Amino acid sequence: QLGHYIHIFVNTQPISAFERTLSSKRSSCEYDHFLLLVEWHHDGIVEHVPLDDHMDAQHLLLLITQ
Amino acid sequence: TLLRQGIRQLKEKVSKMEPEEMTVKEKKSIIEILKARIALKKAFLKMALSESNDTVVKKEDVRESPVDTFMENAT
Amino acid sequence: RTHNRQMTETLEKYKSLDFNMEKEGDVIQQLKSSIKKP
């Protein structure tokens, strides 16, 4: 328009409220750990949009900017 | 805890609009120092939070369900 | 003989008889004994 961008990565969300509240059976104490990331930028804000296939290339460029 | 009774008890400690107030209320401010450090008694979190702790409760309320079922398989 | 007496006596347990699944009835065992509870 004159950067203005989204870096893409990997996330973690440990929280004890689900973590050790079960643990040692159907909730592993470790994960350990990694997910997904898509950070909107420019200016002064970062969307944390859900990241789930099925997906198309256009969406992050579009829907976010929509 | 002590604060809980201390609200209802600091309630009527006040004595009219007269300067009878602060003569006791400065020592009450000392009590406010004491309770200010009673806040230190609760300086850290145990179990998470309501309702996240309550979510743990309901989590137990789902976790109790197998307990009420497998006994049916005793024979 | 130990496998005899012991596996046979233990054939009946909290699981009852090992045939307690009753084949097709055991298809309901994951539900009628479980999901049916309310």
Side-chain angles (χ1 to χ4, degrees), chain A, chain B residues 6 19 36 39 43 48 66 74, chain C residues 25 38:
Chain A
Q1 186 172 356
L2 296 176
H4 182 62
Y5 65 93
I6 288 103
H7 294 297
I8 296 171
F9 302 106
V10 172
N11 197 30
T12 59
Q13 295 178 336
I15 294 100
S16 63
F18 64 87
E19 182 184 2
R20 295 182 181 175
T21 58
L22 284 75
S23 180
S24 63
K25 187 181 175 63
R26 307 291 165 263
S27 295
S28 65
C29 295
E30 293 181 351
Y31 293 134
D32 186 65
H33 175 59
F34 53 91
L35 296 173
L36 295 175
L37 287 176
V38 164
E39 298 88 357
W40 183 81
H41 294 289
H42 291 285
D43 185 66
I45 294 169
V46 175
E47 294 181 353
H48 296 80
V49 296
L51 302 178
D52 54 352
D53 290 344
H54 310 293
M55 289 301 296
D56 290 345
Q58 289 179 333
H59 297 293
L60 295 174
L61 295 174
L62 293 176
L63 299 171
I64 290 172
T65 58
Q66 296 179 339

